[PDB]
């Protein structure tokens, strides 16, 4: 076929297996407790999720 020359392989580990669910970036993904967010995206949506800066 022809569309086979456009599909990516289904990776199970490595940096290529995880993307931010809000912007699609590869790299600095926060994996704690199942979050999948960049360090950039988490900073601006943290107050809505209920986190606070106590100290």
């Amino acid at each position: 076929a022809k569309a086979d020359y456009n599909k990516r392989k289904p990776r199970k580990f490595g940096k290529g297996a995880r993307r931010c669910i809000r912007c699609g970036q590869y790299g600095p993904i926060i994996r704690i407790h199942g979050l999948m967010l960049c360090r950039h995206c988490f900073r601006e949506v943290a107050p809505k999720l209920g986190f606070r800066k106590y100290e």
Binding site: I30, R39, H40
Partner: protein, 100 residues
């Protein structure tokens, strides 16, 4: 013959309101209740670099989420069991009921 009730929430006031409702229900009848036991709080702490780029001094944010818990043990009585099954929690409280 005894039922175990677990509660959890991020808001400390709603937890106490639901627990007080249960305590009033139990007192409003003849039934023995093992008082609301406070279990250790869950803290979720996440530390992140602030700047989007890598230039400048390195500074950090420390975000925190706190989850409070309670534990109540009461003997299963049909007159009182229906009442505690009829009480409806606020949307930010989790409740689970089991038979031991």
């Amino acid at each position: 013959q005894k039922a175990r009730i677990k509660l959890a929430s991020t808001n400390v006031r709603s937890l106490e309101e639901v627990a007080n409702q249960i305590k009033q229900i139990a007192e409003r009848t003849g039934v023995r209740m093992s008082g609301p036991i406070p279990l250790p709080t869950k803290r979720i702490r996440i530390v992140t670099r602030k700047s989007p780029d890598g230039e400048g001094s390195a500074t950090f944010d420390r975000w925190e989420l706190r989850i409070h818990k309670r534990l109540i043990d009461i003997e299963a009585d049909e007159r009182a069991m229906r009442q505690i099954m009829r009480i409806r929690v606020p949307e930010d409280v989790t409740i689970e009921i089991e038979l031991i």
